[PDB]
Design a protein around this ligand. Structure first.
Ligand SMILES: CSc1cccc(Br)c1CC(=O)N1CCC[C@H](C(N)=O)C1
Ligand SMILES: [Zn+2]
Length: 139
């Protein structure tokens, strides 16, 4: 679990979104596993606007932060789950690192701010759902 709080916005994994998230829905995309919802209290997170391919992410299953090299946002095939049928998820960045089901929501940061959140994983890999293209979070 985890979320990005930037201004009057909350960015969460679409599969982990609450009833309140849907009641104050701003934007959602199944293919990216993202859901943004309006909050009534001011956020704080700086959103990175960059092309960094290295960073640090919080691993909930180890209570530790890990430095990683990650790929550029792309369409990577993600297998069937209780939340989605087998499909291509876009804006995904894979990395070599530890990941497990309860890790979705962990923030990936670089020297410029928040890059994205943990979305996929498995097999000694971790997948991040990029948010750097969503310029309207800061405006
Ligand atoms: C039990 S499979 C597994 C294994 C290691 C790490 C992780 Br995180 C998972 C779970 C996983 O990748 N997903 C399930 C939830 C929705 C995700 C999506 N964005 O489509 C995909
Ligand atoms: Zn950066």
């Amino acid at each position: 679990s985890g979320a990005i709080y930037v201004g009057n916005y909350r960015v969460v994994n679409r599969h982990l979104a609450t009833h309140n998230d849907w009641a104050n829905l701003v934007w959602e995309d199944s293919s990216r596993d993202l859901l943004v919802s309006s909050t009534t209290a001011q956020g704080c997170d700086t959103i990175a606007r960059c092309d960094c391919q290295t960073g640090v992410y919080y691993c909930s299953s180890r209570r530790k932060h890990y430095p990683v090299s990650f790929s550029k946002p792309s369409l990577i095939f993600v297998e069937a789950s209780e939340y989605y049928p087998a499909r291509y998820q876009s804006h995904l960045m894979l990395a070599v690192g530890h990941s497990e089901p309860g890790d979705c929501g962990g923030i990936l940061r670089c020297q410029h701010g928040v890059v994205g959140i943990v979305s996929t994983g498995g097999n000694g890999l971790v997948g991040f759902a990029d948010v750097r293209d969503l310029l309207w979070l800061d405006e």
